[PDB]
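Run: sequence + 2,4,6-tris(chloromethyl)-1,3,5-triazine -> complex structure.
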Amino acid sequence: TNLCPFGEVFNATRFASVYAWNRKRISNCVADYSVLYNSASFSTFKCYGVSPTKLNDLCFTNVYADSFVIRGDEVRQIAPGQTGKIADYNYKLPDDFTGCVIAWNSNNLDSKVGGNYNYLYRLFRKSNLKPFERDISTEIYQAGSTPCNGVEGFNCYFPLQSYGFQPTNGVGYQPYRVVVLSFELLHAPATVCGP
Amino acid sequence: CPYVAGRXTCLXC
Ligand SMILES: *Cc1nc(C*)nc(C*)n1
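>> structure
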C-alpha cells in the first residue's frame, strides 16, 4: 500500500496525556483527506493557513500528526492565538500554523465508572511554552517563598494533575481525542500527496 | 484513586 498510516493515528489504543503529546511523522505516502473531512465523527475539523477543501490537491514535504486527550471545553485552546492552561502550559500552536485540528468525543473509551484519572495535564509552570514545545519535567512547583526540597507540601505542588473523566460528566467535561496535522513545506521534494 | 486526595496528581480532589 502507498496509503498514509492515518489508520494507526486515529485507531491508536493509547493516546498521550496532553503534557506529553505524541508526534507521529507521516512521509512518503498518499491520503484522501476528504475521507477525514467528510466524517460525521469529527466534531472539530478546523484548518489554519490552508482550506480543508484544497488538501487533496496539495503535496507536502512531511506531515506531522500530534495526538492527545483533553476536555471537550479545552478543544478551543488548540488553535493559533489562544491562552489557557492547555495552550500556555501543555500544547501551543504558532500564529503562522499551517495545519488542521481534528477532535472527537472519546467518553466511551476514556471515561470509567468511578472516574478515569489516568490522563494528565500540566497545571503549573514558571513560563508559557513556545509553539510546539514539549515539557515532560516533574519538578515540584514552588508557588510561595519557601523552597520545596523536592517534596509536596504547602505552596509546593506536583505540576501534573489528573483529569477526572466520569461517564456522567457534562459533555464539555468529557474526554476528547485530538489529532493535529501540520503540513510542512521545505525547499525539498514533496513526499505526502493527495490521491 | 491513583493518589490520596491532595497528593500526587489528585491535588484538586
Ligand atoms: C479517585 C480520585 N483520584 C483523583 C486523582 N482525584 C480524585 C478527586 N479522585
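>> summary
DSSP finds no helices and no strands in chain B. Chain B touches chain A through eight residues (CB under 8 Å).
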